[PDB]
């Protein structure tokens, strides 16, 4: 979708394996603000918006 | 109230000590008050900030 009409995703009751995703070699920007990458594979969430 | 002075010392120490407690739930300007939260959420650069 674009800017304007930007998709609000609900992710939750899931097991996360963010492992892969940092692995991938493929990223043009890849940045993490208020939590480390590598430490997402031992936190527990909910609500995840994307 | 008759023994009140003992017992105003009693309270002023234990008014400091409460104090003193709650005080480590206050961040200070950090992102959370926990030590735990920031070892387990950041990256040592920051994480030392």
């Known amino acids: ?50 | 109230s008759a023994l009140g002075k003992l017992q105003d010392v009693v309270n002023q120490n234990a008014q400091a000590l409460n104090t003193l407690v709650k005080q480590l739930s206050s961040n200070f300007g950090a992102i959370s008050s926990v030590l735990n939260d920031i070892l387990s959420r950041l990256d040592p650069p920051e994480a030392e900030v």
């Open chain 1, 1 to 50: 979708a674009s800017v304007y009409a930007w998709n609000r995703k609900r992710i939750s009751n899931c097991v996360a394996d963010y492992s892969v995703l940092y692995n991938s070699a493929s990223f043009s920007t890849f940045k993490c603000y208020g939590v480390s990458p590598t430490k997402l594979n031992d936190l527990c969430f909910t609500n995840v918006y994307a």
